[PDB]
Amino acid sequence: SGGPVPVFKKYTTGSKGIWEKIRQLLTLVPNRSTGNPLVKNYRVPPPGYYDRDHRRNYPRLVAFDQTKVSGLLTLGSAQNPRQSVSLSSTLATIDPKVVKSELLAEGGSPVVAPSLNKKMKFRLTEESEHGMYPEDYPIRIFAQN
Amino acid sequence: LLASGSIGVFGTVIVGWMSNSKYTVLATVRTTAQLISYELVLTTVVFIIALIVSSLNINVIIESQYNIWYIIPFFPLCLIFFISALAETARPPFDNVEAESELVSGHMTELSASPFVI
Amino acid sequence: TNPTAFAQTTRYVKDSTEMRTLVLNLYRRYLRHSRGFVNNYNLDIPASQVRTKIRQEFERQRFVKDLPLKNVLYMKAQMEFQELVNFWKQQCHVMQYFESIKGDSFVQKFLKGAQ
Amino acid sequence: TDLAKELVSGAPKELITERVARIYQETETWKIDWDILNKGNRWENDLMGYQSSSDYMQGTILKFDTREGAIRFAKGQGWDYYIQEPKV
Amino acid sequence: KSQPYDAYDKVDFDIAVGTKGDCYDRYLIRMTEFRQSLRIIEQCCNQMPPGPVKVEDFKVAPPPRALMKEDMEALIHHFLLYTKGYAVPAGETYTAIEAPKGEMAVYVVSDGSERPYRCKIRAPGFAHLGAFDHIARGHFLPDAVAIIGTMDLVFGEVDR
Amino acid sequence: ALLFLPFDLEVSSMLPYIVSIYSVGIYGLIIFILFLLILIVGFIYEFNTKSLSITTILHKKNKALVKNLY
Amino acid sequence: PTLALTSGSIQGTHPEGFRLPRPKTWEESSESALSKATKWYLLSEIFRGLYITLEMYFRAPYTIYYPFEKGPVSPRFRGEHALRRYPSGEERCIACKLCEAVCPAQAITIEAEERIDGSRRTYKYDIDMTKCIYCGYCQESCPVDAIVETPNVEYATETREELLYNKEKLLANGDKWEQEIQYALDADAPYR
Amino acid sequence: EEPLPVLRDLPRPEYGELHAPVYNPAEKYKEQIEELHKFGRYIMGCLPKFVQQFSVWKDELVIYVAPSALTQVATFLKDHTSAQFKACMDVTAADYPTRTNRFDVVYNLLSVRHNSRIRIKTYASEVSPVPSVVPLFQGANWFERETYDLFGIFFEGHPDLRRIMTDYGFQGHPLRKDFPTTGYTEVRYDAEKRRVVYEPLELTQAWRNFTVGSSVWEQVGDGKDFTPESFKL
Amino acid sequence: QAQEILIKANKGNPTGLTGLFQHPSPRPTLITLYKATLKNLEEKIPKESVYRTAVEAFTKERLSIVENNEIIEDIEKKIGSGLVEELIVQANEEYDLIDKMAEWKAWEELEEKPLDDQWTYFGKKL
Amino acid sequence: ATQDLPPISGYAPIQWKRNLPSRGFRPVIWFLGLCTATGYGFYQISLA
Ligand SMILES: CCCCCCCCCCCC(=O)OC[C@H](COP(=O)(O)OCC[N+](C)(C)C)OC(=O)CCCCCCCCCCC
Ligand SMILES: CCCCCCCCCCCC(=O)OC[C@H](COP(=O)(O)OCC[N+](C)(C)C)OC(=O)CCCCCCCCCCC
Ligand code: SF4
Ligand code: SF4
């Protein structure tokens, strides 16, 4: 948790002597550093086959047109079995009980657009948690819950 | 002192006048409407000080502050004077005369060499 | 959103006759702004010269035949009108637009290098 | 095929007339490229030996799929061309 | 969050949402993006795992120089990587990431060749500048600067 | 700009009272306050009508969408 | 079970308390009228803003004094292209044309032939430093570390012609910067 | 009042043998491929007349329609509450000269509500117009102008279509395959004319073509199928 | 019959999302517009059109859930498609589509058939 | 050992939440000071 941190826990140039106590009396926030890095620590020493293959097994490119689309409702599926063959005529003459299981899900209810990530669930947070602006500021903070 | 301030105000509005119209004449109705308005507030502040000493002589005004400095009684006026002092000179934050991000160099975009120095 | 000055919707015209009348008005629009093009771009050629060049431009390609290619030629010529009238092309491009431009015998081309 | 599409492609006048495009086959697909210029295709720069050029179509090659597809394109643009039949 | 990628699911951070849709709100969101980004940097430093830094497939990555000059298989892939390049299997893709400006995405078509066929780049600054007319209408000339600034325009990205 | 001319003549006409604030005594002070209260009504009038505001009427108009079922 | 029955999702579910509360009116402000007026009239936040700026006036500036001092550099720094050389004196480069192929900006021009001794070397090797992007594929492509980028950056020239580096100019730098390139390589050996 | 540590002197773990897992990334899309196939079938169910075909690559869904059927499908994909694709992120194109309709106009849509993206792909020729999606999305006003400028595609119904990426008075549409990468002309300054003038192209060094030593062999094959068994014959 | 249904208000309390004011009397107005949707299907869209079946699959489902719940919060939570103000928008713009979809006759056969080579990418059939 | 890895304990937490504590006396005190400064000032002017 990123609470306030004293000056002597930040790798920066500090104050030595009575000037430290002068600084802590004049500066508005005594736990802020000057920002100059620590010369004594910061950058002190300078910098001086098939089992493991997947590209060849990339998912294939298969296109589903009106001809093949009609075949799933009539013949069924390759898991649960049941030229130009137009779909529009098939929808005009076919059993709605085929529709309520194949062409639709959960009793004809329309299929909500598939989420790119299901677990994107948000919750509204509060000031004492995220340490951000108080309530009057015109933003709100969301989290992943 | 106040009269000579007015002449410089009229001196500035000449800068953005008739020298084509790209950026100087954009900041001349803007300029004139600024250092006109604050010249009211600056003038009133001066007179209120002169009212306290009943004199229009700067030496009398200076010599009459022996036992008190008008920063103590007239602290609001000093802020108001300085705010008006900034705006009259067109210094920032009241610096839309030469609005660098808006009017390139403001009214001095045409000026170069000696006209700029003066 | 607010469209700019001298804008027209891009429409696929499905008539031979309507395109004829659209072009005719367009040619007048160029001639109406003949004085402006001289004063806007500070062209060295007088107003009559620009109309002469505009006429040479319009006379040049009046014999096209394909309607699907008629709309494309009307669409882009509209852009040329819109770019020029709105004063968008720089001064140099208009000066060089009118500053562009008989062959030589085989001996002349043989000697220097031909192409 | 009958369309004068050259007035919409914006290509210079020299492509229609003074340039020749070869439709060849290097082993399953066909390609189009323009034959080299008579002079000025490649002259040695006298400063650093760079291979200078005035031909702007030297670096252009179009990968096609079928022969008739390439011929359709060449007629569509109004391009002069010839076809090189590969040896069997 | 919508499409996690590159060890963003592992870390935790809070997104910021405004309420008024003006420049001051977008400022607060951008300032919050400072601290939330600094929050992840602590997590990335702490949670750093060991191991390799690139895929150990010589066909899509150069082999180490200690091994290029020792192993005949290593030198061949070094020679082949830098002259012909690796070939991308055919397909098409549109991957969008949270760029600092916004949604930046590339549309890439692979023609089975070592060179991409089509590379369209979605620049977040491109679309925002289009909405300048909708946003700036009715404001004053000084407000034009404020609107441009809050759009975070970088015209190298706009005119890609 | 036009309203600067009145208010500037008001301020610049208070000069006589500055150098004579003593001798005129209370009588001048009561006259001086009246000379302002008359000009305050001018100040009050411009305050109410919002004459100084630049105003934004040419744009920033919105409406509520309403279904018109038939 | 999901909300597909109602054509909704758990995604479409806004969090509890998503909707805004009622906005305050003038009677619901914590700071009294006098308290707000004093902050407003006396410029409380501006004066605080001034003080914090004055804090930085008593801090050490970050400025360094070029050219008397330089900023830090790393052993991986990509600067002036340079052609290296063996200790025995023979050129490291054997004219792959790996150089001419990788170069994204096509700034490398190589022409080679059999030397007199027969060992494969190149007689032309030109870099158009005005065309180069200092990408770094020079250094990575070499199987003999013949072309490397020195940590130098101060070589600006009056005439652009001086920015076309032929072989001799590249070889001159390779000798002139050899000891420095030793610092760079021997400090970056483990990570390659 | 305590001294700061030195991080270089902190104790560190020692790591030896590495076991980096090597498994097909396509496994994490096993459900994603399954979800999207139904949704495309659903759209074809709701639009038998317009949805010619569709295909799903990993977590991406593509809808192919004719130019006539473009605005109709995009309106359905915007308003229909099952698929609320309110934002049109990208309007792109590409050139494939072999086919009669060489161009391939793309439409990437974003659904903030349902958290998904779709791709409407409608072909276009050098002369066949495409209806503008401005009446649905005003955000394509600048994405279409880029497509017209770089391809010449004629967009039907654009409120104002013109050049947005090329120079004023530029000739030709660059992103075509027949357009040379170096262009036809380049500019310079001519002192006598006292202006910057266009001139025919001249290269001191021509663009060397290194594609000649390309691959002559096959690189990638069919691959491994991952189609969910519910979408097979 | 001359009626007026309030789609979105132009004043009042904000609803988090900018430019989306709080609807004064949403719950019956949602019920009215939801009911008017089912009337529009019965007049324009044929029976076999799966778009018609897909509208009722959630219009009846949601509209029934709205009536039982008398708290505005509970209407959103169980339907799970955002705020109440947004739920008005979803119902309204879906109503217009029923008018437009019937005009298009999108229940018919494929109007324009693609050519042979159109949907093949780089020679290999998709 | 032969790489860059964070320490076993990691590092101490960093400060990242907003930390802007206020300063100065309450506005009433500043207001009261302004009155006294005026109240004392007009006593000195009046004496003069
Ligand atoms: C009796 C008491 C006497 C006090 C005399 C002094 C008064 C001064 C002005 C107070 C009112 C004011 O600064 O107002 C602020 C005004 C107008 O703000 P507004 O339009 O009302 O918006 C605020 C709406 N609120 C009420 C909801 C918050 O704009 C400004 O930000 C002006 C900024 C001026 C900066 C000048 C810097 C100069 C620094 C000088 C020292 C280094
Ligand atoms: C001799 C004086 C000269 C200057 C006169 C004007 C000063 C400004 C204060 C008047 C307005 C007011 O009332 O400010 C009040 C405000 C806000 O306080 P709050 O939010 O209620 O505090 C919260 C709750 N506490 C009280 C528990 C903390 O305080 C300030 O932030 C004061 C700013 C600090 C520095 C000011 C001086 C910096 C300039 C350098 C001069 C030394
Ligand atoms: S550094 Fe890169 S771009 Fe520059 S010359 Fe070398 S390979 Fe080419
Ligand atoms: S990679 Fe090295 S050896 Fe090969 S051509 Fe380049 S510099 Fe010469």
TrEMBL record, chain A:
Report which superkingdom the organism of origin falls in: Eukaryota
Keywords assigned? Oxidoreductase, Ubiquinone
EC numbers listed for it are: 1.6.5.3
The GO terms describing molecular function are: oxidoreductase activity
EC class of this enzyme?
oxidoreductase
Record's protein name: BA75_00589T0
Q: What is the lineage of its organism?
A: Eukaryota, Fungi, Dikarya, Ascomycota, Saccharomycotina
Per the record, the gene is nuzm
TrEMBL record, chain B:
Q: Where in the cell is it found?
A: Membrane; Mitochondrion inner membrane
Regions crossing the membrane: 1-19, 40-62, 68-87
Q: Which gene encodes it?
A: nu1M
In the record, the note on similarity to other proteins reads: Belongs to the complex I subunit 1 family.
Write the protein's name. NADH-ubiquinone oxidoreductase chain 1
**Superkingdom:** Eukaryota
UniProtKB/TrEMBL annotation, chain C:
**A Pfam family hit:** Complex1_LYR
Q: Name one GO molecular function term.
A: oxidoreductase activity
**What GO terms in the biological process aspect are recorded for it?**
response to oxidative stress
Q: Which UniProt keywords apply?
A: Electron transport, Membrane, Mitochondrion, Mitochondrion inner membrane, Oxidoreductase, Respiratory chain, Transport, Ubiquinone
Subcellular location(s) of the protein = Mitochondrion inner membrane
Please list the residue ranges annotated as the Complex 1 LYR protein domain: 23-82
EC? 1.6.5.3
Q: Which membrane topology describes this protein?
A: Peripheral membrane protein
Instruction: Cite the CDD domains for this sequence.
Output: Complex1_LYR_NDUFA6_LYRM6
GO CC, alphabetical: mitochondrial inner membrane; respiratory chain complex I
Q: Which top EC class is given?
A: oxidoreductase
Q: Which family does it belong to?
A: Belongs to the complex I LYR family.
Name of the featured protein: BA75_04796T0
Source organism of the structure: Komagataella pastoris
From TrEMBL, chain E:
Query: What family, per the record?
Result: Belongs to the complex I 49 kDa subunit family.
Q: State the name under which the record lists this protein.
A: NUCM (49 kDa) subunit of mitochondrial NADH:ubiquinone oxidoreductase (Complex I)
Task: Name the source organism.
Answer: Komagataella pastoris
Task: Give the gene name.
Answer: nucm
